[PDB]
Amino acid sequence: LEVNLAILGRRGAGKSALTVKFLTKRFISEYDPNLEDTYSSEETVDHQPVHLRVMDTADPRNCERYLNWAHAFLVVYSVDSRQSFDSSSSYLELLALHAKETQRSIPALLLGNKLDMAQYRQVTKAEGVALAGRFGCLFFEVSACLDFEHVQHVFHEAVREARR
Ligand SMILES: Nc1nc2c(ncn2[C@@H]2O[C@H](COP(=O)(O)OP(=O)(O)O)[C@@H](O)[C@H]2O)c(=O)[nH]1
Ligand SMILES: [Mg+2]
Ligand SMILES: [Mg+2]
């Protein structure tokens, strides 16, 4: 089973850090901000094997490259950046519009990353919940430089959302 996951969000939000942590179980803090690519991994989600494809985007034009490809989305902002949070809402609007225009119904997970920087929070967890509420998507706060298991969970949950 092949599952396409696309990761969207404003530059700086930690899209690649989250991807590399998922893939490698390590935090890599400087990763080419311009590099966009699809990363392949063999996963097991609910005792079921998956060929997972993770598209780590770097933005704007030809959004269909992910809009007509992904089976689920992660939309990422940083909890220490209002700017990032605001940009996250635009990606969710795009997902909504595309679904409306094409009938393509794809689940999304809203991610407030850099939970390790919670002391400099510009966005509350309650506000992330509210934003997810406006788009009917799931919501998680995560970090690329805490443990691996919580990052694995969100990626595997996108898989579960894609299978439902
Ligand atoms: N403190 C902290 N910094 C992070 C985290 N994730 C990414 N970063 C940093 O945020 C910046 C952008 O990360 P990057 O993965 O390039 O984000 P991208 O542009 O969305 O792909 C870099 O300085 C990363 O080191 C995180 O979870 N916690
Ligand atoms: Mg990146
Ligand atoms: Mg490639």
Distance 97 CA to ligand 2 centre (A): 24
Residue spans per domain, the chain: 1-164
Helical pair 15-24 and 149-163, crossing angle rounded to 10 deg: 100
Distance 152 CA to ligand 1 centre (A): 17
To the question of whether residue 41 is assigned a binding role by annotation, the answer is no
Residue ranges lining ligand 1, Cβ < 6 Å: 9, 11-17, 29, 31, 33, 113-114, 116-117, 143-145
Q: How was this structure determined?
A: X-ray
To the question of whether residue 15 is assigned a binding role by annotation, the answer is yes
- Per-position DSSP letters for the chain, written without gaps between them: -EEEEEEE--TTSSHHHHHHHHHHSS--S---TT--EEEEEEEEETTEEEEEEEEE------THHHHTT-SEEEEEEETT-HHHHHHHHHHHHHHHHHHHHH-----EEEEEE-GGGGGG-SS-HHHHHHHHHHHT-EEEE--SSS-SHHHHHHHHHHHHHHH-
Q: Give the resolution value in Å.
A: 1.9
Residue 126 sits at φ, ψ, to 5 deg, of: -60, -40
CATH architecture of 1-164: 3-Layer(aba) Sandwich (3.40)
- Residue 81 contacts residue 12 (beta carbons within 8 Å): yes
Distance 130 CA to ligand 2 centre (A): 26
Distance 11 CA to ligand 1 centre (A): 9
Atom in ligand 1 nearest the alpha carbon of residue 19: 15
The ligand minimizing its distance to the Cα of 37 is: 3
